[PDB]
Amino acid sequence: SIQAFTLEYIEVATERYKTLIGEGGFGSVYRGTLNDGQEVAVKVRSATSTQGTREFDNELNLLSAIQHENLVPLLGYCNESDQQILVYPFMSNGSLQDRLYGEPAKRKILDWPTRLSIALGAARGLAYLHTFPGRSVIHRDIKSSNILLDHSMCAKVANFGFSKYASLEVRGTAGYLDPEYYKTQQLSEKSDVFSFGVVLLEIVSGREPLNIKRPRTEWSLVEWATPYIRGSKVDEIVDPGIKGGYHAEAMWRVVEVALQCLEPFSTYRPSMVAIVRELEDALIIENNAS
């Protein structure tokens, strides 16, 4: 069950917050270790994404109830001396972003069967959120750095600081934001589906969504890849490191799904439940490339 921690316990566990992993919605994340030796990621208070005890209480009740094999589980929390802290298990294989085009991608290549299994698991975690009993939970910042990988490379969707049960400002992450958002002023399940479509193109192509260091025609992954997909020239966008390591039909159905996720108008995008079923069939096909 979820554990309450004192601010002192978190101080020892993080060793004076020495080891910083990054910054998120809820705040900065530090690496820690519990008394039982469990490695944890410790997310501490950010001023802009915090209010008080009452607001943190509903967020805490939500995160505790969200349980699924493809979501990072909440292990514990600290609310003491005005510090709001969330404690998650440490995912030792990092993010999908790191494995595609970060530092680990320099040393080793994520093969296509592992990539397809990661897409399916991430889609299953997102579908669980969209069908959460009582009230659908929108992630609202889906992206490849928010898909973490455990020791067996199973995907776990992370980082629900922006999540909420289903004002105009900057939202999402550059490259992933629903193209209708400034016309609707709302993020919905179908906004999450658009962002997941970008993730699928990252998985297929090995490329980040935006890169001004590429030639101008290649600056944007979505805009670059869409004409090849529609022109039955999918091999032109596939990551060179996995060329020849994929079953043709498995790859075609994955990019077909990505293309529907990327539809500019929300009602044409599939549900996450429909995306799971397509990726499941694609994974079967790939496994039968004997």
Residue numbers in the entry: 580 to 745, 754 to 877
Question: Could you give the paper's own sentences about this structure?
Answer:
To understand the signaling function of SYMRK in root nodule symbiosis, we expressed, purified, and determined the crystal structure of the core kinase domain. A diffraction dataset extending to 1.95 Å was collected, and the phase problem was solved by molecular replacement using a homology model created from the Arabidopsis thaliana BIK1 kinase structure. The overall crystal structure of the SYMRK kinase domain resembles other eukaryotic kinases of the IRAK4/Pelle-type and A. thaliana BAK1 (16) and BIK1. As predicted from the sequence, SYMRK has all the canonical structural motifs required for ATP binding and catalytic activity. The SYMRK kinase crystallized in an inactive conformation, with a broken catalytic spine (C-spine) due to the lack of a bound nucleotide. However, ATP can easily be docked into its predicted binding site. The regulatory spine (R-spine) is assembled, but the C-helix is in an inactive “out” position, leaving the salt bridge between the catalytic lysine (K622) and αC-glutamate (E638) broken. We mapped the phosphorylation sites onto the structure of SYMRK and used Alphafold2 to model the remaining C-terminal part missing in the crystal structure. The phosphorylation sites are located in three distinct regions, with five in the kinase core domain (S731, S751, S754, T760, and S807), four sites in the border region between the kinase domain and the distal C-terminal tail, which we named the “alpha-I motif” (S877, S885, S889, and S893), and seven sites in the distal C-terminal tail region (S903, T905, S906, S910, T911, S916, and S918). The mechanism of SYMRK activation is possibly trans-autophosphorylation since the alpha-I motif is located within an extended alpha-I helix that sterically would hinder cis-autophosphorylation.
